[PDB]
């Protein structure tokens with residue numbers, strides 16, 4: 001009954017729109033378009049896997065609310081799929097955008113790798129979205145990405161890959177895993193020192209879900225572990241609860257990558273932000289210089305001044 005950002009088509013599970021599924025709307029969009037194609041998705045639950053391929057550029061998902069618009073599935077590695085192919089939603093075509101919607105994978109802790117959202121789109125952004133799963137929830141696979149005011153939940157390596165991404169003003173919570181497991185917020189995979197990639201968490205809130213908080217002393221949680229030799233992750237200007245063990249970071253396999261990785265922390269607050277008991281690795285560092293920290297902000301790390309304004313979402317370029 002209204003139009004904000006120009007809508008090209010309407011999807012509705014109750015049958016009151018143009019098509020009943022999200023996949024139908026993506027199929028209708030023309031290839032190689034210079035203008036944006038907007039898909040409005042009405043309230044409801046959509047049981048389907050969705051793919052946005054390389055030739056479908058500048059596509060936007062516009063839901064009616066993060067709490068009421070859900071895309072769900074349950075592909076996983078324990079049952080036969082590969083990590084890459086297990087994603088409920090896969091966004092590859094350049095310039096993808098999404099707001100007010102949920103992406104989820106319901107496989108569970110016992111099914112191992114099971115992705116909710118995989119992104120390989122250059123210059124893509126997400127606003128007011130929820131991404132929910134257990135092991136490997138968010139696959140930030142490749143290219144430049146931006147997440148603002150989003151909620152992400154998971155257990156083992158739930159934010160992983162080799163893209164250049166910044167998550168600003170977000171809520172990131174670890175949940176209760178399976179017996180004997182340990183949670184890891186990130187698993188960055190840079191393999192060469194000349195690659196311009198890494199994971200940055202800025203002005204956000206890191207904590208625990210309601211089912212984990214009471215038993216944090218039975219399921220340890222860390223900020224991350226080095227999947228590849230030149231892993232690079234930064235946490236700055238954020239609040240951190242005591243869900244994070246004092247050591248801060250965890251090894252991958254012995255002394256692998258400890259001398260070549262770059263894990264840094266700048267002006268964080270909260271019980272979990274103390275640095276006096278952190279690991280002794282050569283690659284770990286407490287940043288005290290503002291010029292060093294500024295290099296990881298949107299304007300300097302993902303060329304934000306050239307495209308964030310055109311996303312129609314809110315943003316901040318510096319410190």
Ligand SMILES: C[As](C)(=O)[O-]
Nearest residue numbers: 001002010016017
């Ligand atoms: C009459 As109608 C397209 O707003 O449901």
Ligand SMILES: C[As](C)(=O)[O-]
Nearest residue numbers: 083157160187227
């Ligand atoms: C080995 As992994 C980063 O898929 O958990």
